[PDB]
Design a protein around this ligand. Sequence first.
Ligand code: NA
Lengths: 48, 49
Amino acid sequence: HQLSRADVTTVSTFIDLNITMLEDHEFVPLEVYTRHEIKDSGLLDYTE
Amino acid sequence: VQFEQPRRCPTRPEGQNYTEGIAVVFKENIAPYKFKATMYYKDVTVSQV
Ligand code: NA
């Protein structure tokens, strides 16, 4: 008779190692207080 | 001599469990409270000439 390799049970001598790449990441600008908020926190503005 | 028998292999960590959720982050308020006012006064000028 005749067989394909898919017709034979396959065992592996290979040791698995699943390494995945660290993904791209985007850092958006972030501020707790903008400089306009810091300017506006004063009660009276001398210039205005 | 004999060969060392197979060692106990390490175990992959369980992995950090994460709770999904929605959040609102609040900061200390530094903006003054603002409102609208109306001033009624009278400019009084006395000129000695
Ligand atoms: Na041995």
